[PDB]
């Protein structure tokens, strides 16, 4: 199979070297390929390298942005992305082909490369308060707006496991300012909206920000 290096957050002009360890097959019987996947252009072929004699082929679109090399010893391929921009933000995959034959059968698990001027910031959990009314009988809904954090991920739980149900912790969104927002939501019975205590258990490992926050009706205009 194919195991790649971990995710990476880096700043604009910088450069990254991603790795892919082949194991369990003859490293040199396969050309190793690199593929970009990001919302915008979808799936794109960056290029490929033959491990034997290190022959390369690059997509004109990535010509120069990327440089592929290989270590036959370690059965490993490397991709180097240079002169980075925020548009190069993507998941990058390695995969293989066999000259015979097949395919693009096995893919690496992918390496997330995030490119942002923005520097590390913690969230700002704000309460989405349950309104007085009504709705169509039951039930009632409340949540936390996890606003302005960098970079992903954040983990939001509710009552730490005592609320694995009815909960929707949405995907993030990158605002202008280059900062992410997230909103979690739970749906609770219209009756006990003042019998149970709901605290957002947001933690954001990229800094050491673990925030608790409870949510209640406020009673003003």
């Amino acid at each position: 199979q194919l195991v790649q290096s971990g995710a990476e957050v880096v700043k604009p002009g910088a450069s990254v070297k991603v790795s892919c360890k082949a194991s369990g097959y003859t490293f040199t019987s396969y050309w190793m390929h690199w593929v970009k996947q990001a919302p915008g252009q979808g799936l794109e072929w960056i290029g490929a390298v033959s491990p034997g004699n290190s022959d390369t082929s690059y997509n004109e679109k990535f010509k120069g942005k990327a440089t592929l090399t290989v270590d036959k010893s370690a059965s490993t391929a490397y991709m180097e992305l240079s002169s980075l921009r925020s548009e190069d933000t993507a998941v990058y995959y390695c995969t293989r082909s066999r000259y015979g034959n097949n395919a693009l059968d096995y893919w690496g698990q992918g390496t997330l490369v995030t490119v942002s001027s923005a520097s590390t910031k913690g969230p700002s959990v704000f309460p989405l308060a349950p309104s007085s009314k009504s709705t169509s009988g039951g039930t009632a809904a409340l949540g936390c707006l996890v606003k302005d954090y960098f970079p992903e991920p954040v983990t939001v739980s509710w009552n730490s496991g005592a609320l694995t149900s009815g909960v929707h912790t949405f995907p993030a969104v990158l605002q202008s300012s280059g900062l992410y927002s997230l909103s979690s939501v739970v749906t609770v019975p219209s009756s006990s909206l003042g019998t149970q205590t709901y605290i957002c258990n947001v933690n954001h490992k990229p800094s050491n920000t673990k925030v608790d926050k409870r949510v209640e009706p406020k009673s003003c205009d």
């Binding site: 794109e44 072929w45 395919a103 893919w107 704000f126 989405l128 809904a141 927002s181 909103s183």
Partner: protein
């Protein structure tokens, strides 16, 4: 670049159904086509290579066929494991190119969204910006239109949408459109609508505060 075009872009079906996805290349590619499967969060897996050849491991309900510009992948009886996105990739000419995907989702019986709106919390407004969040909960199909209205005026270009994957129980969806404004621009104000249109709604339900 060879352009690959998949049909349909989205497809709804149920366990047991024979399903067919298609791919049209902008020129003859001589069966140099691969079909991929990708579940969300996860990496692609090759299913079919060179038009008709199964990858090892790939269960036999999967099969591809076609020639020249037109190819289809066919799942003869869908399994719960088979709901994913599918891609064709072409390697007849340089560079290899990819189709944009056919998402294969679960069919269930409509059911309408429950709507909930939330004004900004009070600590937020102390600082520069006001964030108002509308929620649409557990609906189907995915199609849904969310329109804010401030003092009954339709606004554009300062809301962000965000949808969940298909719930593991409900097979429904959920949606979060947030409208963001500075505290100053925020106070006109209080009539703040969240008008939502949907297929299981007789009429655009609105929530305001």
């Amino acid at each position: 670049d060879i352009q690959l075009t998949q049909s349909p872009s989205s497809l709804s079906a149920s366990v047991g159904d024979r399903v067919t996805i298609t791919c049209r290349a902008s020129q003859g590619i001589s069966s140099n086509i691969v079909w991929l499967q990708q579940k969300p969060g996860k990496a692609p897996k090759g299913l079919i290579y060179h038009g008709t050849n199964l990858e090892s491991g790939v269960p036999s309900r999967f099969s591809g066929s076609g020639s020249g510009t037109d190819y289809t992948l066919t799942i003869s009886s869908l399994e719960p494991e088979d709901f994913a996105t599918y891609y064709c990739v072409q390697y007849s000419q340089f560079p290899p190119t990819f189709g944009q995907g056919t998402k294969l989702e679960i069919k269930r019986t409509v059911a309408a969204p429950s709507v909930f709106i939330f004004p900004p919390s009070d600590e937020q407004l102390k600082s520069g910006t006001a964030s108002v969040v509308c929620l649409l909960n557990n609906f189907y199909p995915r199609e849904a239109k969310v329109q804010w209205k401030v003092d009954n005026a339709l606004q554009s270009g300062n809301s962000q949408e965000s949808v969940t994957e298909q719930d593991s129980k409900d097979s429904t969806y959920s949606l979060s459109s947030t409208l963001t404004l500075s505290k100053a621009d925020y106070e006109k104000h209080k009539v703040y609508a969240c008008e939502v249109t949907h297929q299981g709604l007789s009429s655009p339900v609105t929530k305001s505060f």
